[PDB]
């Protein structure tokens, strides 16, 4: 299976068959047979141990033989003196470690060793912690011994700051190692962190500064090492609220309240539903997804009765409570307003960029100054170049937007196998910038023309957008997540590579759909627009579905309600 | 090759050698009367699943001996309902799922007692939602997967506590977006396959951070074009399958260089003999032959039948039984 060089066993080794050591396989099979016969006869004695130790000593993954040793050993505990059983156990431990040397990643062998140790009144844990240290110096990437360490630590109690203790004493003349950063990524959050609400970092700023500087000395001392960089990416990024309804919106005309959550959720499932309080008095409503299917969704809505919007008071007030977390969205809809809402900015409500204190800005910005310097030593180091990008982002998306773009182009030339990931990641960040540009200017128009977008992201943050320019990019589909765009009236998506337009379905206010110069092949890809209640201007010019029939009449029957269909 | 970091591709096989692979598997059990055939008897039921599945992906299932396989399988069910790798060995969920996958291929499920299989699967579920591999207790998310896969193919996903099951798998999600075998274990490709497969079967893919996990998975591509199973390991055809399947499942298959990975996998073929090995120039076996074939199929190779990234079985087999989990997009 692994690592077996194809050398001398091929039809060209001028040593034909001679495929023996079946002397070993006969021995093997007889021994096997003989164990199986003992066991059904109920002979649970040291004879089974001897014969299985022969077979497991050469193949420690014959799991059924571990079951057999367990049945014997269990049996013997109630027949052997305490000191006879203590020698059997010692002998078992050494026999296990020998079997681990045959295969250091044998699942049945390790579990056999957990079974035995968890049933000792008083184990020697130093024996066990030393075996881990041994199998890790022979292979530092053996994660089985890191799990076995967590087993020792939980069995012996070992409290969680003493275990981080351990990892510290490993940041120095130790090494790198996905397995120790992984462990701290579990230990810290257990040991310190208190996600209170407002400010949104991964680690108590207090520890997140220093755990940055930590992994700094690690990626500076060996840039060409990756665990440090991977762990550092996590450190930069966001804790997730969850206690986030992030938008609520009402339209008088649609008589509909729409909500967008931070993550796709099912309303009315295990731990949450939405309650509605309208004029500070309760309203029983049926929540749904735009498509009426009720799958997990960022965007949910409900119908409102005329009494929630009528002119019986000059105002209505609509408080939405999601009961999973107990986070709250009230919007207030005034006498003659067509709409009202309450939304989370990208800007203030830390939608995707961590807000920085002076102290934090100074360390990230100093590690800005550092990754460049390094870049001049190691210009093809792809990890440094991504982390420069990621470091601009935490830091100030807006201003280093030009640099960001040049860094992406360099990293793409340096790491061409991820070119598709990097375009998608650059698209995401440009759409984030645009949301800041839209919100900064307080409008509802999003302009993402000529940005070389290859994918759309964050669409649930666009619930109030009324005009979207996506023209001149490299999009291949308008995805179903576009269903969050509940106010969208005008979508300019001409001059892209679109071949699928399914997420335009169920858009309630979309009047104008410009799809000029795209890759809509067979009409038919137009079928979903049937569900667009307001569409009035469909421009399909420049697609090859236009050379179809007399096309301007199939589409009329497909889309009888669409007043102007340009092919 | 082999370096710490990767392999070098030595101008060798750049063509798909389908006839050779099919002769390899067909005559695999007939090479002799010794070898690892004896010493791999502890996984036999899985080895039969690998050889059947690859043969069928390749349109050549009829070259294999259905009847005897059917006799073999029935003889490995134990009275508790779980099946063993082979005759006289102990039942285990691993070999339970293999047996069920083979009988799905042959539309011959009721060769074995199906309510029994169910109750075997139900008995392994723990309080917290996890699944042990067998009565001796090892907990692994790979068995969460095997449990929900096995029941999906039987139409009885309802028989276990699906909510708690889901909750245990999600409690094994790590800081890199991947999953380990139990809470706090490290991410690696086999483990991410089991979990994303699980979350696919149970309709929970919206819980996965596709962008973060998909990034981690696309970073498994080495300059040779092979994938490894985690940072700093050599490329391998089996980790490459696990990573590719996980990427398709989470909607991120375009994040990999498809042509380089194609090349790498093609380089793992043994021109003489047929079969694929873990890496170029190594010894071939059926497990790597299945994943070399399934990966190529997932990369677009039209000669090969389309394979599911959840089940590792011909998609037309699963369509037929109506079992097609919805993937991300
Ligand atoms: Zn492999």
Q: Is the distance from CB of B318 to CB of B311 less than 8 angstroms?
A: yes
CA A486/CA A250 separation, integer angstroms: 10
Domain CATH code at residue A88: 1.25.40.120
Rg of chain A on CA atoms, in Å:
32
Domains of chain B, each with CATH number or no CATH: 1-329 (1.50.10.20)
The two beta strands, A467-469 and A339-343, are unpaired
Contacts across the A-B interface (CB distance below 8 Å): 139
Q: Name the residue with tokens 């199906």.
A: B114
Residue A283 gets which letter from DSSP? Answer: E
Same domain, A233 and A250: no
Give how far Cα A54 sits from Cα of A20, A24, A30, A141, A565, Å.
19, 11, 11, 29, 80
Give the residue from B174, B184, B203 with the most A CB atoms within 10 Å of its CB, the best one to mutate. Answer: B184
* Residue A482, number of CB atoms within 10 A of its CB: 25
Q: How far, in Å, is the centroid of ligand 1 from the Cα of A565?
A: 55
Dihedral sign, CA of A81, A87, A91, A96?
A: positive
Q: H or E segment at A235? A: helix A227-236
Q: H or E segment at A302? A: strand A297-303
User: What distance lies between CA A331 and its chain's CA centroid?
Assistant: 32
Q: Is B240 annotated as a binding residue?
A: yes
CA B289/CA B279 separation, integer angstroms: 11
Long-range pairs, A25-31, Cβ under 8 A, ≥24: A25/B34, A25/B35, A25/B38, A25/B39, A27/A54, A28/A55, A28/A58, A28/B38, A28/B39, A29/B38, A31/A55
Q: Is the distance from CB of A74 to CB of A31 less than 8 angstroms?
A: no
Residue A282 gets which letter from DSSP? Answer: E
Q: What residues of chain B lie within 8 A of the CB of A203, using their CB? A: none
Which of A163, A169, A204 is CA-nearest to residue A184?
A: A163
The phi and psi torsions of B34 (rounded to 5 degrees) equal -145, -120
Using DSSP's 3-state secondary structure scheme, residue B240 falls into: helix
Same domain, A470 and A551: yes
Last-in-domain residue among A429, A449, A469: A429
Q: Name the residue with tokens 């994938």.
A: B227
Q: Is the distance from CB of A113 to CB of A96 less than 8 angstroms?
A: yes
Q: Cβ–Cβ of A6/B277 closer than 8 Å?
A: yes
Residue B270 in contact with partner chain A when CB distance is under 8 A = yes
Dihedral sign, CA of A448, A454, A458, A462?
A: positive
Same domain, A92 and A183: yes
Give the orientation angle of helix A82-102 with respect to helix A46-58, to 10 degrees.
Answer: 20
Contacts of A158 (CB under 8 A, 6+ apart): A152
* Residue B30, number of CB atoms within 10 A of its CB: 9
Q: What is the resolution of this structure in A?
A: 2.0
The phi and psi torsions of A477 (rounded to 5 degrees) equal -150, 150
The two beta strands, A315-322 and A274-278, are antiparallel
Give how far Cα A503 sits from Cα of A239, A298, A303, A478, A545, Å.
29, 14, 21, 5, 19
CA A164/CA A510 separation, integer angstroms: 55
Q: Is the distance from CB of A565 to CB of A523 less than 8 angstroms?
A: no
The phi and psi torsions of B107 (rounded to 5 degrees) equal 35, 60
CA B115/CA B121 separation, integer angstroms: 10
Dihedral sign, CA of A208, A210, A213, A215?
A: negative
Last-in-domain residue among A429, A453, A476: A429
Which of B278, B4, B88, B166 is CA-nearest to residue A141?
A: B4
CA B317/CA B106 separation, integer angstroms: 9
Q: For A402-436, b where at least 16 C-beta lie within 10 A, e where not — what string?
A: eebbebbebbbebbebbebbbbbbbbbbbbbbbbb
Last-in-domain residue among A402, A429, A456: A429
How many helices (H) and strands (E) chain A has is answered by: 17, 14
* Residue A23, number of CB atoms within 10 A of its CB: 8
DSSP labels for A192-205? S----SSS--SS-H
Q: Name the residue with tokens 């039948």.
A: B305
Q: After which residues is chain A broken (C to N over 2.5 A)?
A: none
Q: Name the residue with tokens 């009961």.
A: A323
Q: Is the distance from CB of B81 to CB of B117 less than 8 angstroms?
A: yes
| Sheet with A297-303, edge to edge strand ranges | A297-303, A256-265, A245-251, A339-343
* Residue A307, number of CB atoms within 10 A of its CB: 11
Give how far Cα A370 sits from Cα of A172, A363, A377, B5, Å.
20, 10, 11, 26
Q: What residues of chain B lie within 8 A of the CB of A416, using their CB? A: 257
Domain CATH code at residue A319: 2.60.40.1130
User: What distance lies between CA A181 and its chain's CA centroid?
Assistant: 18
Same domain, A361 and A424: yes
What 3 state SS string does A438-486 have?
Answer: HHHCCCCEEECCCCCCCCCCCHHHHCCCCEEECCCCCCCECCHHHHHCC
Same domain, A424 and A435: no
Nearest to A1 among B2, B175, B285 (CB): B285
Q: Is the distance from CB of A141 to CB of A178 less than 8 angstroms?
A: yes
The phi and psi torsions of A558 (rounded to 5 degrees) equal -80, -35
Residue B43 class from Cβ within 10 Å (0-12 exposed, 13-18 middle, 19+ buried)?
A: buried
Q: How far is A408 from chain B (nearest CA, A)?
A: 15
| Sheet with A512-514, edge to edge strand ranges | A445-447, A467-469, A490-492, A512-514, A537-539, A564-566
Q: Is the distance from CB of A67 to CB of B90 less than 8 angstroms?
A: yes
Same domain, A421 and A286: no
Q: Cβ–Cβ of A63/B92 closer than 8 Å?
A: yes
Residue A522 class from Cβ within 10 Å (0-12 exposed, 13-18 middle, 19+ buried)?
A: exposed
Which of A322, A266, A273, A260 is CA-nearest to residue A482?
A: A260
Q: How far, in Å, is the centroid of ligand 1 from the Cα of B291?
A: 9
Same domain, A110 and A231: yes
Report residue A337 as tokens.
Answer: 């307003």
Which of A480, A221, A477 is CA-nearest to residue A374?
A: A221
Same domain, A42 and A147: yes
Same domain, A529 and A519: yes
Q: H or E segment at A68? A: helix A63-77
Report residue B61 as tokens.
Answer: 């299932």
Task: Give the bridge partners for B276, in sequence order.
Answer: B269, B285
Strand spans (E) along chain B = none
Q: What is the tally of structural domains in chain A?
A: 3
- Closest CA in chain B for residue A9: B283
Give the orientation angle of helix B210-218 with respect to helix B189-201, to 10 degrees.
Answer: 150
Give how far Cα A512 sits from Cα of A478, A491, A532, B146, Å.
15, 6, 11, 49
Q: Is the distance from CB of A205 to CB of A359 less than 8 angstroms?
A: yes
Report residue A512 as tokens.
Answer: 């104008």
Domain CATH code at residue A539: 3.80.10.10
Q: Is the distance from CB of A422 to CB of A411 less than 8 angstroms?
A: yes
Which of B33, B135, B138 is CA-nearest to residue B90?
A: B135
Q: Is B130 annotated as a binding residue?
A: no
Report residue B34 as tokens.
Answer: 């010794």
Q: Cβ–Cβ of B186/A143 closer than 8 Å?
A: yes
Same domain, A493 and A417: no
Give how far Cα A128 sits from Cα of A146, A339, A355, B72, B89, Å.
12, 66, 45, 41, 30
Q: H or E segment at A185? A: helix A178-191
Q: Cβ–Cβ of A1/B233 closer than 8 Å?
A: no
Q: For A119-139, b where at least 16 C-beta lie within 10 A, e where not — what string?
A: eeeebeeeebbebbeebbeee
Q: H or E segment at B170? A: helix B162-170
Q: Is the distance from CB of B125 to CB of B147 less than 8 angstroms?
A: yes
Q: Cβ–Cβ of B185/A147 closer than 8 Å?
A: yes
CA B241/CA B1 separation, integer angstroms: 20
Using DSSP's 3-state secondary structure scheme, residue A129 falls into: helix
CA A93/CA A100 separation, integer angstroms: 11
The two beta strands, A282-283 and A245-251, are unpaired
Report residue A313 as tokens.
Answer: 């008071």
Q: Is the distance from CB of A331 to CB of A279 less than 8 angstroms?
A: no
Report residue B31 as tokens.
Answer: 């090479």
> What's chain A's length in residues?
567
Q: H or E segment at A246? A: strand A245-251
Q: Is the distance from CB of A258 to CB of A333 less than 8 angstroms?
A: no
* Residue A186, number of CB atoms within 10 A of its CB: 20
Q: How far is A546 from chain B (nearest CA, A)?
A: 28
Same domain, A420 and A551: no
CA B194/CA B237 separation, integer angstroms: 17
Q: What is the dihedral of CA A275, A281, A283, A289, to 10 degrees?
A: -40
Long-range pairs, A411-415, Cβ under 8 A, ≥24: A411/A382, A411/A385, A411/A386, A414/A379, A414/A380, A414/A382, A414/A385, A415/A382
Q: Cβ–Cβ of B137/A115 closer than 8 Å?
A: yes
Same domain, A38 and A94: yes
Q: Is the distance from CB of B172 to CB of B145 less than 8 angstroms?
A: no
Q: Is B241 annotated as a binding residue?
A: yes
Q: Which residues span the domain enclosing A321?
A: 242-344
Helix, strand, coil proportions of chain A in percent (round to 5)?
45, 15, 40
CA A259/CA A250 separation, integer angstroms: 9
Residue B88 in contact with partner chain A when CB distance is under 8 A = yes
Q: Name the residue with tokens 């309760």.
A: A282
CA B159/CA A564 separation, integer angstroms: 53
Q: Is A157 left (phi over 0), alpha (psi -120 to 50) or beta?
A: left
Which of A419, A364, A412 is CA-nearest to residue A390?
A: A364
Rg of chain B on CA atoms, in Å:
19
Q: How was this structure determined?
A: X-ray
Residue A249 gets which letter from DSSP? Answer: E
């Amino acid at each position: 299976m692994h690592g077996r060089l194809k050398v001398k066993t091929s039809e060209e080794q001028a040593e034909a068959k001679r495929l023996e050591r079946e002397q070993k396989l006969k021995l093997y099979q007889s021994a096997t047979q003989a164990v199986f016969q003992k066991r059904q006869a109920g002979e649970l004695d040291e004879s089974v141990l001897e014969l299985t130790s022969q077979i497991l000593g050469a193949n420690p993954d014959f799991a059924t033989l571990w079951n057999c040793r367990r049945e014997v050993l269990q049996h013997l505990e109630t027949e052997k003196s305490p000191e006879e059983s203590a020698a059997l156990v010692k002998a078992e431990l050494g026999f296990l470690e020998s079997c681990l040397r045959v295969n250091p990643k044998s699942y049945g062998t390790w579990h056999h060793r957990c079974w035995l140790l968890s049933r000792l009144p008083e184990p020697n844990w130093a024996r066990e912690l030393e075996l881990c240290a041994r199998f890790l110096e022979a292979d530092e990437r053996n994660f089985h011994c890191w799990d076995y360490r967590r087993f020792v630590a939980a069995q012996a109690a070992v409290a969680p700051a003493e275990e981080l203790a351990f990892t510290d004493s490993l940041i120095t003349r130790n090494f790198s190692n996905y397995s120790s950063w992984h462990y701290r990524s579990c230990l810290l959050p257990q040991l310190h962190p208190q996600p209170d609400s407002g400010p949104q970092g991964r680690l108590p700023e207090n520890v997140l500064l220093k755990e940055l500087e930590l992994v700094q000395n690690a990626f500076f001392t060996d840039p060409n090492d990756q665990s440090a960089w991977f762990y550092h990416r996590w450190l930069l990024g966001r804790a997730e609220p969850h206690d986030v309804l992030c938008c609520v919106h009402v339209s008088r005309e649609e008589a509909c309240l729409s909500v967008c959550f931070s993550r796709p959720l099912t309303v009315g499932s295990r731990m949450g539903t939405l309650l509605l309080m309208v004029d500070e008095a309760p309203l029983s409503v049926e929540w749904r997804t735009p498509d009426g299917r009720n799958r997990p969704s960022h965007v949910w809505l409900c119908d409102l009765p005329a009494a929630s919007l009528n002119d019986q008071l000059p105002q209505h007030t609509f408080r939405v409570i999601w009961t999973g977390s107990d986070s709250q969205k009230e919007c207030v809809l005034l006498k003659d307003r067509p709409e009202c809402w309450c939304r989370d900015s990208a800007t203030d409500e830390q939608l995707f960029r961590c807000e920085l204190s002076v102290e934090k800005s100074t360390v990230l910005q100093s590690e800005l100054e550092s990754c460049k310097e390094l870049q001049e030593l190691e210009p093809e180091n792809k990890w440094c170049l991504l982390t420069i990008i990621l470091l601009m982002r935490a830091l100030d998306p807006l201003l280093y937007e030009k640099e960001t773009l040049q860094y992406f182009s360099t990293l793409k030339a340096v790491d061409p196998m991820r070119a598709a990931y990097l375009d998608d990641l650059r698209s995401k960040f440009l759409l984030e910038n645009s949301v800041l540009k839209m919100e900064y200017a307080d409008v509802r128009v999003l302009h993402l023309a000529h940005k070389d977008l290859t994918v759309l992201c964050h669409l649930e943050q666009l619930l109030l957008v009324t005009h979207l320019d996506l023209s001149h990019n490299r999009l291949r589909a308008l995805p179903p997540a576009l269903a969050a765009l509940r106010c969208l009236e005008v979508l300019q998506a001409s001059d892209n590579a679109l071949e699928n337009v399914d997420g335009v379905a169920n858009l309630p206010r979309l009047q104008e759909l410009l799809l000029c110069n795209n890759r809509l092949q067979q009409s038919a890809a137009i079928q979903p627009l049937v569900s667009c209640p307001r569409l009035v201007l469909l421009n399909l010019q420049g697609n090859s579905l236009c050379q179809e029939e007399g096309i301007q009449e199939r589409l009329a029957e497909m889309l009888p309600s669409v007043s102007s269909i340009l092919t | 090759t082999q370096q710490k970091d990767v392999t070098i591709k030595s101008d060798a096989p750049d063509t798909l050698l389908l006839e050779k692979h099919a002769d390899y598997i067909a005559s695999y059990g007939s090479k002799k009367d010794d070898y690892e055939y004896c010493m791999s008897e502890y996984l036999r039921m899985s080895g039969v699943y690998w050889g059947l599945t690859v043969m069928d992906l390749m349109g050549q299932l009829h070259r294999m001996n259905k009847e005897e396989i059917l006799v073999f399988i029935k003889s490995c069910q134990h009275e508790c309902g779980g099946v063993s790798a082979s005759i006289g060995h102990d039942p285990h969920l691993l070999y339970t799922l293999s047996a069920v996958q083979i009988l799905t291929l042959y539309d011959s499920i009721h060769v074995i007692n199906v309510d029994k299989v169910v109750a075997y699967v139900q008995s392994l579920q723990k309080e917290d939602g996890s699944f042990a591999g067998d009565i001796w207790g090892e907990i692994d998310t790979r068995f969460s997967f095997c449990a929900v896969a096995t029941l999906a193919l039987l139409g009885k996903l309802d028989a276990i506590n699906v909510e708690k099951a889901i909750e245990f798998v999600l409690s094994c999600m790590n800081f890199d977006g991947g999953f380990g075998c139990r809470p706090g274990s490290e991410s690696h490709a086999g483990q991410i396959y089991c979990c994303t497969g699980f979350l696919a079967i149970t309709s929970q893919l919206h819980q996965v951070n596709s962008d973060l996990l998909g990034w981690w998975l696309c970073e498994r591509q080495l300059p040779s074009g092979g994938l490894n199973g985690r940072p700093e390991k050599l490329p391998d055809v089996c980790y490459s399958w696990w990573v590719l399947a996980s990427l398709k499942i989470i909607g991120r298959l375009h994040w990999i260089d498809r042509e380089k990975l194609r090349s790498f996998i093609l380089a793992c073929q043994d021109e003489e003999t047929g079969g694929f090995a873990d890496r170029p120039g190594d010894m071939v076996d059926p497990f790597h032959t299945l994943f070399g074939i399934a990966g190529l199929s997932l990369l677009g190779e039209e000669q090969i039948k389309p394979v599911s990234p959840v089940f590792c079985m011909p998609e037309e087999v699963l369509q037929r039984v109506n079992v097609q989990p919805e993937l991300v997009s």
